[PDB]
């Protein structure tokens, strides 16, 4: 029936293109394989049997739904069928319908894939009850080596699909809202988490914010006919720090993200003391590594089918945190970090950005208070080092990156360029500078590179703005003794100018004139070097330049073929 499921999927896809039920309804069969879709990838009763013993039939004969197949059940077929039963813990006659239809194991996999895929597409109480069973079945399931690898890939696909189906059930409303504690606890028991994190965020941000269900009265004086607000309050009280709560750092993060949302759901301070019902519980979460977990998630960000949606959710979460929590931001940085902060916050912002909801958030950011905050960041060197990363995170979104750049601008870039020239001069007078200060500069140049590439106008401004003096400063840094991260950010800067050729080629020629030095650099590279991390960026820059049209004038000074030697 796997082929039939595939055929149904095509019809569903056809409906999708047209936005109409028509393809599904113009092909009946949905209302035929309907409990097969509800059962999902479970084969829950027809696992391996000894009453279904295929080869003990002395006439070689088996029955299905309806007709029978005595003269075709020859000994080669018997062996493919028992190979299925031993391999997968599957009923023997079921394994035979799976060889008759369509390689039988592959067909069975397709049937699991087709139904699951169809469900995911649709999303994009048997079924709600069957999620747990499906999860359990997968756990039970968990040239030969290649086959094993293929099985592992299939398992990964299963752990990747279903993730969409579970998300969709949250979006449609069906698993709300008493299934939170069961979802959270299961997650605590458990990179697969990123499906889970993606699921949680929206629910905190909308479904647990103001929807809720009006039922689930597990207590008689806690809730009444309207459980909406009553459950929000019950979750708030339920959520706490405990002695082994610091080992599930994932639960801490999800619990903090609730407090972030919960701050905006609270109409006023009438019921709730802020300095017992928010600020300690959020602080206690901060001291349990919740912010670190978000950074880890950003590090773990990876392209997924629902991945863009997950990124949008992350952007929404970031918006919730700058929006409703600046007291916590100020408490951490402006009092506890400096004394014992802002840099950490900037790093977190960059992380979130890198991980189009994010773009929308960047657009929203795109004011006087924000400018004051930027000035404060510029004041302290550490604070300034947070700001560039934050700006790039705005930079990462395609709408967002341009918008983020505009927000940073509304001057600052020129000041950064001046610092680079000044910093370079200081270095010359004196990787020849405090590690925290150098890392700051790496972040300045990394925010610079990102903002230039993302927006054509910004890149153009960087390329040809006299005050900034980026091309010359970069060259001086390169010439002076310097660190590998720093030389990489010079090349990322050069990329903007490249995208903006004669000007670049002339500069290259000037550098060559200022190549014995280049040969020496190559020799140094051969001697080293820090694991080749520096090599790739330079190679990429060379490739972009090559993409740019060649100039006859360049290489003129050397005889005959200046372009060729590079």
């Amino acid at each position: 029936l796997w082929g039939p499921y595939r055929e149904i999927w095509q019809t569903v896809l056809s409906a999708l293109i047209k936005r109409q039920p028509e393809a599904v309804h113009s092909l009946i069969v949905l209302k035929k394989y309907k409990p097969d879709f509800i059962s999902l990838f479970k084969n829950p009763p027809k696992s391996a049997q000894q009453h279904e013993r295929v080869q003990k039939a002395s006439t070689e004969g088996i029955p299905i739904k309806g007709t029978q197949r005595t003269r075709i059940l020859e000994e080669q077929l018997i062996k493919e069928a028992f190979i299925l039963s031993d391999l997968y813990n599957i009923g023997e006659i079921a394994a035979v319908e799976l060889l008759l239809i369509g390689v039988a194991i592959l067909l069975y996999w397709d049937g699991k894939s087709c139904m699951a895929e169809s469900l995911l597409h649709l999303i994009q109480q048997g079924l709600t009850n069957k999620i747990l069973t499906l999860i359990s079945q997968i756990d039970v399931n968990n040239g030969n080596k290649k086959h094993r690898k293929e099985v592992s890939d299939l398992i990964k696909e299963c752990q990747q699909s279903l993730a969409h189906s579970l998300y969709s059930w949250s979006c449609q409303t069906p698993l709300n809202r008493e299934d939170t504690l069961l979802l959270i606890g299961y997650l605590e028991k458990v990179k697969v988490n990123l499906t889970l994190l993606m699921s949680l965020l929206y629910c905190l941000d909308v479904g647990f914010l103001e929807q809720g269900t009006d039922d689930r009265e597990e207590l008689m004086k806690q809730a009444s006919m309207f459980m909406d607000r009553q459950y929000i309050a019950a979750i708030h009280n339920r959520l706490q720090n405990t002695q082994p709560w610091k080992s599930p750092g994932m639960q801490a993060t999800v619990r903090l993200a609730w407090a972030l949302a919960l701050r905006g759901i609270s109409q006023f301070s009438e019921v709730l003391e802020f300095s017992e019902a928010d600020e300690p519980m959020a602080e206690i979460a901060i001291g349990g590594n919740v912010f670190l977990f978000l950074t880890e998630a950003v590090v773990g960000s990876e392209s997924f089918c629902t991945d863009e949606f997950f990124i949008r959710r992350i952007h929404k979460l970031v918006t919730d945190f700058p929006t409703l929590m600046p007291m916590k931001v100020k408490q951490l940085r402006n009092r506890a970090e400096e004394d014992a902060l802002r840099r950490d916050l900037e790093h977190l912002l960059l992380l979130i950005g890198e991980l189009l909801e994010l773009a929308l958030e960047y657009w929203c950011p795109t004011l006087l208070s924000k400018f004051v905050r930027q000035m404060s960041d510029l004041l302290p060197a550490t604070l300034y080092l947070p700001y560039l990363k934050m700006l790039r995170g705005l930079a990462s979104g395609p709408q967002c990156a341009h918008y983020c750049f505009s927000l940073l601008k509304a001057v600052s870039w020129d000041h950064f360029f001046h610092s680079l020239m000044l910093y370079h001069e200081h270095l010359r007078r004196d990787r020849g500078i405090t590690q925290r200060e150098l890392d700051g500069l790496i972040a300045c140049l990394q925010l610079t590179c990102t903002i230039i590439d993302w927006s054509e106008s910004a890149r153009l401004a960087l390329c040809e703005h006299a005050q900034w003096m980026p091309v010359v400063v970069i060259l001086g840094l390169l010439q002076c003794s310097i660190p590998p991260l720093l030389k990489a950010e010079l090349l990322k800067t050069l990329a903007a100018f490249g995208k903006s050729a004669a000007s670049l080629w002339q500069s290259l020629e000037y550098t060559q004139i200022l190549g014995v030095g280049i040969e020496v650099e190559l020799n140094e590279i051969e001697s080293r070097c820090e694991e080749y991390p520096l090599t790739r960026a330079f190679c990429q820059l060379i490739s972009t330049l090559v993409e740019s049209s060649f100039p006859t004038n360049l290489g003129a000074g050397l005889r005959a073929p200046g372009f060729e030697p590079y």
Binding site: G3, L13, S26, G143
Partner: protein
């Protein structure tokens, strides 16, 4: 790249032996090709469309030059040849008024041009016509699915 390699020169007898040195590997490759051919009966779909455009062009551009060659051994001539028949006798090139979907008759044309070369040549007309007259039906299956 197999098309450019196998349409530049007259195929050497040594190469087939080298290919079959593994013995098992050639068979595995043939099985994989058959699976790819059968896989029909959106990025993945796009890839399939591209692969079909390439693979079918490679088999045609090799085929025009002559036989036997690498393609003949990969059709299981001393199978994938039956998969070409199996895909043809299942193909539905009409969707009930949303038009004959022009990718699908193009797929049928690419399968048929191989069969046409394999009944015109002396080498292949004897075996190919013999296996087109046995089950699974050739003339009967195509006249079943042919639309007006």
């Amino acid at each position: 790249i197999l098309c450019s390699i196998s349409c530049n020169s007259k195929i050497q007898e040594k190469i087939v032996g080298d290919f079959t040195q593994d013995q098992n590997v050639s068979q595995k490759l043939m099985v994989g090709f058959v699976s790819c051919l059968d896989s029909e009966e959106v990025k993945q779909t796009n890839i399939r469309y591209m692969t079909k455009i390439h693979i079918l062009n490679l088999l045609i551009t090799s085929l025009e030059m002559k036989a036997p060659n690498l393609a003949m051994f990969l059709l299981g001539y001393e199978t994938c040849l039956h998969s070409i028949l199996d895909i043809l006798r299942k193909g539905t090139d009409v969707r009930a008024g949303p038009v004959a979907v022009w990718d699908t008759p193009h797929l049928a044309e690419l399968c048929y041009q191989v069969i046409y070369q394999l009944c015109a040549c002396a080498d292949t007309s004897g075996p190919t016509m013999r296996y087109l007259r046995t089950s699974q039906d050739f003339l009967f299956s195509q006249l079943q699915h042919l639309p007006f």
